[PDB]
Design an enzyme around this catalytic site. Structure first.
Site, short mmCIF file in Angstrom:
data_model
loop_
_atom_site.label_atom_id
_atom_site.label_comp_id
_atom_site.label_asym_id
_atom_site.label_seq_id
_atom_site.Cartn_x
_atom_site.Cartn_y
_atom_site.Cartn_z
N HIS A 126 7.10 4.10 6.95
CA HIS A 126 6.56 3.68 5.25
C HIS A 126 8.31 4.76 5.06
CE1 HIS A 126 4.62 0.81 2.44
NE2 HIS A 126 3.05 1.14 3.65
N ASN A 140 -2.48 7.66 5.97
CA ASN A 140 -2.87 7.16 7.57
C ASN A 140 -2.06 6.92 8.83
OD1 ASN A 140 -4.92 5.49 6.06
ND2 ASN A 140 -2.96 4.48 5.35
N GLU A 192 0.51 -9.77 4.08
CA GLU A 192 -1.50 -10.25 3.25
C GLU A 192 -1.17 -10.37 1.77
OE1 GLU A 192 -4.07 -10.02 4.41
OE2 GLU A 192 -3.85 -10.83 2.50
N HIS A 243 -2.02 -8.59 -2.47
CA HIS A 243 -3.10 -8.97 -2.22
C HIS A 243 -3.87 -8.38 -3.45
CE1 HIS A 243 -6.49 -7.28 0.00
NE2 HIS A 243 -5.62 -6.84 1.63
N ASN A 292 -8.23 4.07 -8.07
CA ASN A 292 -7.54 4.81 -6.91
C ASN A 292 -8.02 4.37 -5.48
OD1 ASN A 292 -8.70 7.83 -7.03
ND2 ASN A 292 -7.85 7.04 -9.25
N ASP A 335 0.94 -1.06 0.33
CA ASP A 335 0.36 -0.22 -0.25
C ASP A 335 1.01 1.77 -0.06
OD1 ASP A 335 -2.12 1.10 -0.14
OD2 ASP A 335 -2.07 1.44 2.42
N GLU A 395 -0.65 -4.87 12.66
CA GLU A 395 -1.02 -3.64 12.28
C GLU A 395 -2.46 -3.43 12.89
OE1 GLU A 395 -2.04 -2.98 8.49
OE2 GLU A 395 -0.14 -3.94 7.86
N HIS A 432 5.89 -1.97 4.25
CA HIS A 432 6.68 -3.68 3.76
C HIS A 432 7.83 -4.69 3.19
CE1 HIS A 432 2.17 -3.84 5.41
NE2 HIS A 432 2.17 -3.00 4.73
N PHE A 457 -6.67 7.01 0.98
CA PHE A 457 -6.03 5.89 1.97
C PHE A 457 -4.40 6.12 2.12
CE2 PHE A 457 -10.51 5.00 1.50
CZ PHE A 457 -10.70 3.91 2.17
N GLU A 503 3.94 -8.59 -1.56
CA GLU A 503 2.32 -9.18 -1.66
C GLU A 503 1.71 -9.23 -2.56
OE1 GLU A 503 1.23 -5.83 0.91
OE2 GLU A 503 -0.24 -5.27 0.84
#
Lengths: 1011, 1011
Positions: A345, A592, A449, A406, A585, A189, A525, A379, A589, A404
């Site tokens: 991140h 955070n 994930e 996802h 998109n 992400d 998380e 990640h 998000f 990942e």
């Protein structure tokens, strides 16, 4: 051969991974970590060209750079230079889902660089180039000759140019591709960027080299005698006279040393490694490494001759600590850890994911000053300087492989396929081989994930087999599979169960009590801090402190991932997903974090600091019980500063030094507190102040605070009899009350307070009405768009029930003059499509002293969704520079997030009242307010207020904080009752039932007067 | 790009592994396994060319075949056609040790084939080619266009030619390379051959396909209700009308069925596999599969439409059994297994490693007739028809991955390196994916003898994660690591400890009692049957039967790996290592099997059959206790046949039917046995005879036998007084004894029996002397060459002590005539370099009846190594066609290997007395002999004899059995005492102390007479 569309090939002519190398030719230079002239930095001015496809690249670029090519800096991402539009996506892939094939229209970046090589490098030894990170896949050319191919993006890529480099001018040609088959394991992400975003360097080694070095530490039960095992590997020729010395140094003092000729112990039936040597160094009373006291040792390995001539020396930082799990408890140096971690991140404020040392140190300082002791490399593997700074400053590191998936359906589509096992194998084992010598790295991770496949758990216990000294955790599969030693769910709530099919997220207290479960629980998380968020953090940390097997968690996340855009006049402004033309998109998000992009702290960071204190306080009678949460250090740089205040007015104060053992208990006896006869509340506030300045804090830093409620004096006095009584005049449409200089006006058609007059100056631009609706928060919206509606979201429930559309209907409006007052009675009802949602009955009492009293009684239906607010709304006509309020503060707080706010007298400018969230929403609320002063106006009672220049309606409609415009006058929303904000997650209703406005009947009183 | 010198690439454009495919278009054809017209066999006449290097191949070969190219058959190995010399090596690599680089001089085989393709195959669907095995790496071209690259040698390689095949004439070009980077994982103990040694086929599938199918079975505690879980995968488009039917059939009767539309259960957070379907079939009272009763079911999966139109049907053989381990016991269907396995190598008698069905079935018949119930696919995956025949006939299969790194230093050099993890990952997971549906495969294996690395155990529990229904074992690392569920040492002895450094081979009884050990023990390799070997097998099987956690083992191995060479006259003869010019080579270490290359049984196979019987016998008084070792079957095709013999003469016999429960006990009451008054020994022999002919045995097959010793009548009679007394004449150098027709001659200078005369016919060519030395056995030589001497070997100890070089010295030689006899006394001593090793004192008594008596008394020094033999040596001058002996037989036996031989009267031709071992050694010995008849001569007493046409000296010097020449007359060696042969291993002294001639003083008596 399209190597970027094949999972079977991930590298070509790539050297093996290893701990980080400098190739010193002097042990003294290696000992103090002086820069080595054998290690050259290739960062600088490079030639860059962009192409829409790799096939569109002309072959003349292999000989010389194109005249149309521009010049950029390295490391950098070409997306930030206008060559492409960066894409962000949370779950769905930015390309079509057809593994392992990428689309034909593949953005391609051709990097070129010309430079000079010393002739001493070509005569002897091996010269290698290191690419610390290239997103995603790249082909390398040297002097027009093909060298190799790389696929991984977050781990170094090393190639040999000994047979390729020439004396004089040399040209390196790099063809970077945006998408590859490895990009299917890169569904993390973040803003999907591309380019050479990490350092490029040249390293020179001798003919006989130091191949790799493993450092391991072994202790006893009392940690007084330690054994230092050093595994040493060589590449090159085998001669009898090569000797290895591993020397341990503390500062400038040598602690232990050892010299052995090459040759290992017999491992199998016909001998052992002849190119590996073992050194066991004995240390007496070592200084253990921890997040509190980061005690470090310098281990210098050297490859020399029996005569003593040194060939090559390599050095690393060694911390004497052990991480192990017994009895379901994660133990560090024998003590149970309480993780105060936070997800981080790699997001530079200006350069995307180009990370430097300055922002790294600033991040570590901001994290340590806010009581965080751990970080999750999420990640992906990080820039290797980050681990070195974590050793230097003392932060626990959870190293995570860059895996990942996802975007597949199901989640374990690729990870259970054995064909993709080589890719994640080279993506896990290389990172294990690289960052195994860092004591800050305490927990390994497989990725985030990606479901549960056989390859995942295979790599998990590959790490167990190769590196038993560290536990290794994994999320995917429900956080209860065999691929983890630590139970690590995402956003599992403290108490409420959410049983999804086949991957259930039980509450952590219930999860630990499951049949057959023994492993400790650390949340990888939790507590989604997306904008106005982080509610219920107190519940999480009360659960962590109460339960022995709840060892904390990692808050997602540290920093907002917002990119800087420019308007027509050139003013910078932060932008989120969809502002660059990217489709699809997830709209905002990417914000955070607990801090802004420019590392400006959010109001949630204060709550995160308060809930993670290493000192706990308990007030019994007049004594204060101080409990330390430090595991290894003694309280030597702290003092306790108490202060007793009566309604913001200080009476008594003093300083007491702190002497608490690690996990100890100390009694503080306060002097005779003053006993006042005046009305008010006595609040005892204690603070822990550090007098000296540490390596991460300045002199006077506050690390913990706690405030209680002492004996109270209730007001029994009576107001004096006013000589003047208010005059009441009745009009055909208006009720006007005069007191001389003060005049009030009530509109009979609308039933609200129409206007107020001080002299000839009007005070309100809009009449004083009710407000049962707030600007929707990020947790309140959820994952609902205009195209796709989520009926479970709070805002969709409100707008489906017409909370934002209900019109006030006047039921009754009567006026009558009393003996020393004028009494106004009104009663309204909010109706939507014939359904009455709210009914409020007010009683305005206009006293002769000048104070006017508002008593609100609101009936709320429960079949409609519970309102986010029960309060008053008005817009003042005067803009004041300073706002005074006595209550909880001085930062923004909410009913579920108010444990960090302190009850005192606060004076702040009006600009600091509005926090600048990138997505506008309800902000600036202050709870527990007993008195509020703004300009010539004074409000008293018990209410929650926020004050700004922007209306609630503008906060709803406007989506960017830079598009907000200050309205005329000042908007004020006084709320008797406010609904909590939640924060467990940002896709489900996270507001607890105890913070929802669900009583049905509500009452609050207000006193309005001019000071 | 040199893809054969890179471990990072193991395949290019290769399809995924799967269970075996036929692509039926009719369910009835799939049900009965009729051949499918969609599956074409490409085996036949191919065009072959040889080159010394891949770079020497001209590019004109890609367009058309060379006119100088020869035509060979496929599958075949080009080494057997004269293009190269096959190399055999046990441990050391055939190339230089420099991974991953192979030498430049790389033998290359270019295969070409032209053929036709039907136009219906090109219009629709996908056409793929399957290469069942290519040694080692190959590049594939279709019509001059490059297709892909393969590296593995024992697993199928599949490529797509749908976009490559054309209508009409098509040419396939295959460039096979002998050495590659994958050859470093191919250090198994076989003749290193090369070529396309397995089948090549073309397979046609529709557009929408059946990708893979998993079959699993689940039972309860009583095994009366079974659940059949079928996982079904698809490749192609996703439509709603595709349906799957899994049908189970027993014979022609349907047992269960199920139809479900595509779509799986929700596995992760946002759904599951939409291209996978699950079928659960319920079976009531299933017939369980086992090695005794191979009950099989036919499961036919079909992909059809909702209207019922079939697209594709695939079928497999399903056996309802479970293999699991609890309480440290390997349980099959709830019963503890006793493994009677044997290691097997794919070695065709004439075609190298080109394996066909005929030799497979012959192998299975020979194994099952000799009481073997298991086979170890060593050390590689096998031809998939072998597993099908193991299902059909009922043999347990231990599937082993083709991994062996015996040539690195140390053993775990590559297997601990993470860079080689992709190679062994694709070498393990593909074989798991291929052979997971075979019920005969009960135990997985990672490979043989590659040390212990992290990658090994990682793959081990990858197999545990993917296939939990089967245990998985591994050897390397000392057979006690975490990479195995079954303790599997190589050649661990029953009692004696051999503690090697860091990899100790404890005795199995002591191994099972180690602290913290719980796993069962099954020997992966034990009882080395190299030539005249397999001694102490009775001790191994007594240990297996006594101990519950000793569950048998695998004998290494089944068949000798000997290649056929031709002499100057064209007569074939078996050859071993070094006979083809290969250097280096382990000289005859490729013949370790229980049968010859032409499947001729060795004498050791009879002992292996006797020690593995499923019926145990115990004689108490006159009753016989029959104990069955069958776990699932009742004794319905067996009868007990007893016979009482007095010195080879039958007296009483009869047949009793057998009725024993599985692991049951039955009492047999024998009638009144006859009681003779004549001298002799009563031997009771019982045999279990199968009356009906099974699928693996013929009518009258004997499966078990056991023989005891009943009441004895000692001889107390006296010989009659001979009327004639022998005349003794004394000469100056000779002693001559006359009895008329019979004349004896003793040489006074040598002290031995010089000659014997019947009428005028001489009887001996060499005088009757002693013999304390035998021809050295394969276990006796060990690993000692002429260049390198092993002092621990028995033969080197003997020749260092001068046992083969000692000269007899005459001490005393006296003669005297008795009243009814002539008495000869002699006494000799064997001296080497002044040290007396052996002293023998004989007493020749020449009676008047004609019998002459020999009493030998031998003193043996113990400081010299213990002799292999104490007996007599002579060469008869008469060659007789038949040889009669009464004793143990009729096969070859030895003091440590005689439990299978039966005491009776045996008549055999002289040619059957000499077993034809390829390496000549001591052979043909028969123990427990009471009477021996050869021509006109008769020997009586208690002795061990062997008789042949070849002297012991010729057996020592000659190294090939075809170079042996029959000498004049007949050689005879009568031995009073013989030393056991050993057989636990072939590189260490394996002779037990109870079978060594170490008493010091020995005595035996002989009676020589003419019948």
């Amino acid at each position: 051969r399209r190597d970027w569309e094949n999972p079977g090939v991930t590298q070509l002519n790539r050297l093996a991974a290893h701990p980080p190398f400098a190739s010193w030719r002097n042990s003294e230079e290696a000992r103090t970590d002086r820069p080595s002239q054998q290690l050259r930095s290739l960062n600088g001015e490079w030639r860059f060209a962009w192409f829409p496809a790799p096939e569109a690249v002309p072959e003349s670029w292999l000989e010389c750079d194109l005249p149309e090519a521009d010049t950029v800096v390295v490391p950098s991402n070409w997306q930030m230079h206008g060559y492409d539009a960066p894409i962000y996506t949370n779950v769905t892939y930015p390309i079509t889902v057809n593994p392992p094939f990428v689309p034909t229209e593949n953005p391609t970046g051709c990097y070129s660089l010309t430079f000079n090589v010393d002739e001493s490098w070509l005569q002897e030894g091996q010269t290698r180039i290191i690419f610390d990170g290239v997103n995603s896949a790249f082909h390398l050319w040297c002097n027009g000759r093909w060298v190799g191919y790389g696929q991984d993006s977050r781990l170094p890529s090393e190639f040999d140019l000994s047979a390729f480099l020439r004396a004089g001018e040399n040209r390196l040609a790099v063809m970077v591709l945006r998408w590859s088959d490895g990009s299917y394991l890169e569904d993390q992400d973040m803003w999907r960027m591309s380019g050479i975003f990490r350092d490029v360097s040249l390293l020179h080694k001798p003919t006989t080299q130091i191949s790799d070095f493993h450092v391991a530490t072994r202790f006893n039960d009392d940690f007084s005698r330690a054994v230092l095992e050093a595994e040493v590997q060589m590449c090159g020729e085998l001669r009898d006279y090569l000797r290895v010395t591993v020397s341990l140094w503390q500062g400038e003092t040598q602690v232990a040393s050892g010299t052995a000729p090459f040759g290992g112990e017999i491992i199998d039936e016909r001998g052992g490694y002849a190119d590996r040597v073992t050194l066991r160094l004995n240390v007496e009373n070592p200084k253990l490494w921890s997040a509190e006291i980061p005690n470090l040792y310098r281990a210098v390995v050297e490859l020399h001759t029996a005569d003593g001539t040194l060939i090559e020396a390599e050095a690393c930082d060694v911390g004497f600590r052990e991480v192990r799990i017994e009895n379901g408890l994660l133990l560090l140096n024998g003590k149970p850890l309480l993780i105060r971690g936070v997800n981080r991140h790699e997001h530079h404020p200006l350069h995307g994911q180009v990370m430097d040392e300055q922002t790294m140190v600033q991040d570590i300082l901001l994290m340590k000053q806010n009581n965080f002791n751990a970080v999750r490399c999420s990640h992906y593997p990080n820039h290797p300087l980050w681990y070195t700074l974590c050793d230097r400053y003392g932060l626990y590191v959870v190293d995570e492989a860059n895996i990942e998936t996802h975007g597949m359906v199901p989640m374990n589509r690729l990870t259970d396929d054995p064909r993709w096992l080589p890719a994640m194998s080279e993506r896990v084992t290389r990172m294990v081989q690289r960052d195994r010598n860092h004591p800050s790295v305490i927990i390994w991770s497989l990725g985030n994930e990606s479901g549960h496949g056989a390859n995942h758990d295979a790599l998990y216990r590959w790490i167990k087999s190769v590196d038993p000294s560290r536990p290794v955790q994994y999320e995917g599969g429900g956080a209860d599979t065999t691929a983890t030693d630590i139970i690590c769910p995402m956003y599992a709530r403290v108490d409420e169960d959410q049983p999804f099919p086949a991957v259930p997220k039980w509450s952590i207290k219930k999860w630990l009590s499951l049949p057959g479960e023994t492993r400790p629980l650390i949340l990888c998380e939790y507590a989604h801090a997306m904008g106005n968020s982080l509610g219920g953090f107190a519940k999480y940390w009360q659960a962590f402190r109460q339960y022995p097997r709840l060892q904390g968690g990692f808050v997602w996340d540290w920093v907002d991932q917002s990119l800087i855009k420019y308007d027509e006049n050139g003013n910078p402004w932060s932008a989120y997903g969809g502002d660059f033309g990217d489709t699809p998109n997830d709209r905002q998000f990417c914000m955070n974090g607990l801090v802004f992009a420019d590392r400006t702290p959010h109001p949630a960071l204060t709550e995160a600091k308060h809930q993670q204190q290493f000192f706990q306080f308990r007030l019994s009678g007049q004594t204060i019980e101080v409990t330390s949460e430090y595991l290894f250090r003694h309280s030597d740089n702290e003092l306790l500063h108490w202060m007793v205040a009566l309604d913001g007015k200080p009476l008594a104060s003093g300083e007491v030094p702190l002497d608490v053992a690690p996990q100890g208990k100390q009694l503080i006896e306060l002097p005779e507190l003053p006993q006042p006869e005046s009305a008010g509340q006595l609040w005892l506030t204690v603070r822990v102040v550090q007098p000296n300045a540490t390596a991460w804090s300045e002199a006077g830093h506050i690390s913990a605070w706690q405030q209680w409620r002492l004996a109270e004096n209730l007001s029994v006095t009576l107001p004096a009899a006013s000589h003047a009584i208010p005059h009441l005049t009745t009009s055909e449409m208006d009720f006007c009350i005069e007191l001389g200089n003060k005049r009030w006006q009530f509109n009979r058609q609308s039933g609200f307070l129409s206007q107020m007059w001080i002299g000839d100056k009007k005070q309100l631009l809009t009449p004083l009405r009710d407000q049962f609706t707030r600007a929707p928060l990020d947790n309140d919206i959820g994952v609902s768009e205009a195209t796709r509606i989520d009926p479970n979201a709070w805002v969709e429930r409100w707008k489906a029930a017409g909370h934002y559309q209900a019109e006030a209907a006047l039921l009754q409006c009567t006026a009558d003059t009393l003996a020393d007052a004028v009494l106004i009675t009104t009663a309204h009802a909010w109706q939507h499509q014939g359904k009455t949602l709210f009914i409020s009955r007010k009683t305005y009492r206009i006293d002769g002293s000048g104070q006017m009293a508002i008593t609100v009684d609101v009936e709320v239906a429960s079949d409609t969704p519970h309102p986010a607010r029960i309060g008053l709304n008005c817009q003042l006509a005067q803009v004041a520079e300073r706002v005074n309020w006595l209550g909880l503060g001085p930062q923004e707080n909410y009913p579920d997030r108010l444990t960090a706010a302190c009850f005192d007298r606060w004076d702040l400018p009006l600009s600091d009242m509005y926090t600048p969230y990138v997505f506008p929403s309800e902000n600036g609320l202050r709870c527990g307010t007993r008195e509020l002063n703004y300009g010539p106006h004074q409000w008293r009672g018990d209410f929650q207020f926020n004050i700004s220049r922007y209306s609630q309606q503008q906060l709803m409609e406007t989506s960017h904080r830079h598009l907000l415009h200050a309205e005329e006058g000042t908007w004020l929303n006084i709320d008797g009752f406010h609904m909590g904000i939640g924060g467990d997650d940002s896709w489900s209703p996270s507001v607890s039932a105890e913070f929802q406005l669900s009583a049905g009947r509500y009452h609050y009183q207000l006193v309005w007067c001019q000071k």
